[PDB]
């Protein structure tokens, strides 16, 4: 019969797809980001004028 | 323009030759101390700022003069002791007096609080080994130890005062800059923060509860008599009572009304104890205790005209005191006991000396206007506007300042000493000439008394 064959050696993993449905990639668990991401800036600080220290 | 050629004495006691030491320490000493009078005195209404804040100006504090004047004449009286001793030994304890002079000349100029703090307390280590080691007599520890577990004890309640300060009311730092000082609204909260800021100016400040720490280490004598000159220095050196009453809490003083009356029976049971008292240290030492706590009294009641006594007092009592310790110390090298009795004759042995005995105690009294009437007098006449029952119990204390002195000249104007046959030899040039550089800055004040008592004069 035309039904057979052999496996020789390995699937090795073989990637394919022909339905997708829905596409679906982004769905995951996650429902918060919790605030995105904390302030930051960046400008270079000069120098600033005398220590904060009591004794300068 | 004074740190810089002070810490340049440093090396030189040390690169010096071994002949020579002395005569190097007294000569620098005397022509720094010339500058002193040059350039510090120029002041406008209000005392504007030096430089930078290392070292400030001096607004209500020619206090810096006396240090300048005692920088040279402590080394003087000093000559007759340390010198059996070796070299190395006399060079530490020449320049151990030159930083005890940086970290003073640091205290009074700096116009802080914060780092006026590790000055104040700066000065205590310096003294400890001064007073600790060259003990004539015993129990050099039971005052060595007493120097700082009475100071440091009070003191250190200063570190959670003045940045509790800082930490809500801007910054100490200038004192010119502290307008931004709000009064205070009377909280049993601000009641410890007052204490703290009292208690470090009220050791060093003698008052009759905790001045036990004072007439233990006059007694038991640190070198010959001259490092004992040193410990009056730190009683005008804390100073910064004119500083914290004036400025950090100037509504406050419901809380000054019991410490007031503490100093002011320092006045009455001081004196009386001043009268039997045997050694001839100990009648200068606790004589230092009544002298200082008219100055406590005085500023606690804050009016503009006690400060003007309160200051002039500060130098009244550095040059009168220290000139009768001078007296004492020429005594002590002679007959070698702090003894009274003991060591009795002027005149008779002691020819042109009894006549500064006679300057010296003449001014424990209230002398035609030199400095100590002048410092005084207003206290007493600020005392009435605070209270009219305070000269009922200032007058008694000033029949005992009469005894504070003239039992003084009693117990040594008396043709006796049969037991003694010692002390051929009055004075040694140097000898009076310490006692002459005492008591002619106070008869250059009688003319000029302006350029002394000025907080705003």
């Known amino acids: 019969k035309x039904x057979x064959x052999x496996x020789x050696x390995x699937x090795x993993x073989x990637x394919x797809x022909x339905x997708x449905x829905x596409x679906x990639x982004x769905x995951x668990x996650x429902x918060x980001x919790x605030x995105x991401x904390x302030x930051x800036x960046x400008x270079x600080x000069x120098x600033x004028x005398x220590x904060x220290x009591x004794x300068x | ?457």
Not at chain 2, 247 to 264: C, G, H, R, V
């Open chain 2, 1 to 457: 323009k004074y740190i810089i050629p002070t810490i340049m004495l440093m090396p030189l006691t040390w690169l010096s030759k071994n002949n020579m030491i002395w005569v190097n320490s007294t000569a620098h000493s005397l022509l720094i101390s010339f500058t002193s009078l040059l350039l510090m005195n120029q002041f406008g209404d209000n005392s504007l700022n030096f430089s930078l804040l290392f070292f400030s100006d001096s607004l209500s504090t020619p206090l810096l003069i006396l240090t300048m004047w005692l920088l040279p004449l402590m080394l003087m009286a000093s000559q007759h002791h340390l010198s059996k001793e070796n070299l190395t030994r006399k060079k530490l304890f020449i320049t151990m007096l030159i930083s005890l002079q940086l970290f003073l000349i640091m205290t009074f100029t700096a116009m802080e609080l914060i780092l006026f703090y590790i000055l104040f307390e700066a000065t205590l280590v310096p003294t400890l080994i001064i007073i600790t080691r060259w003990g004539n007599q015993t129990e050099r520890l039971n005052a060595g130890l007493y120097f700082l577990f009475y100071t440091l004890a009070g003191s250190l309640p200063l570190l959670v005062a003045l940045i509790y300060i800082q930490n809500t009311v801007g910054s100490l730092n200038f004192l010119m800059l502290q307008y931004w000082v709000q009064p205070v609204h009377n909280s049993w909260s601000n009641v410890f923060m007052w204490l703290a800021c009292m208690m470090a100016f009220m050791v060093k400040m003698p008052l009759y509860g905790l001045h036990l720490w004072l007439p233990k280490a006059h007694v038991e004598a640190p070198i010959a008599g001259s490092m004992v000159l040193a410990a009056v220095l730190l009683k005008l050196g804390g100073y910064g009572m004119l500083r914290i009453t004036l400025i950090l809490n100037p509504m406050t003083d419901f809380m000054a009304y019991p410490f007031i009356m503490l100093s002011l029976w320092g006045m009455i049971m001081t004196s009386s104890i001043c009268l039997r008292q045997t050694d001839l240290k100990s009648l200068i030492a606790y004589s230092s205790v009544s002298h200082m706590a008219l100055v406590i009294v005085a500023i606690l009641i804050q009016t503009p005209w006690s400060y003007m006594g309160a200051t002039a007092l500060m130098i009244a009592h550095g040059l009168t005191s220290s000139m009768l310790f001078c007296l004492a110390n020429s005594n002590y090298e002679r007959i070698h006991s702090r003894t009274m009795i003991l060591a009795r004759g002027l005149q008779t042995l002691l020819p042109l000396m009894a006549t500064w005995w006679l300057l010296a105690s003449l001014t424990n009294l209230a002398l035609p206007p030199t400095i100590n009437l002048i410092g005084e007098l207003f206290v007493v006449m600020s005392t009435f506007s605070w209270s009219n029952i305070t000269i009922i119990l200032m007058g008694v204390n000033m029949v005992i300042t009469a005894l504070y002195s003239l039992y003084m000249l009693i117990m040594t104007q008396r043709g006796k000493y049969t037991y003694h046959i010692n002390n051929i030899s009055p004075s040694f040039t140097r000898e009076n000439a310490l006692m002459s550089l005492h008591i002619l800055p106070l008869l250059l004040l009688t003319l000029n008394p302006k350029i002394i008592l000025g907080p705003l004069y």
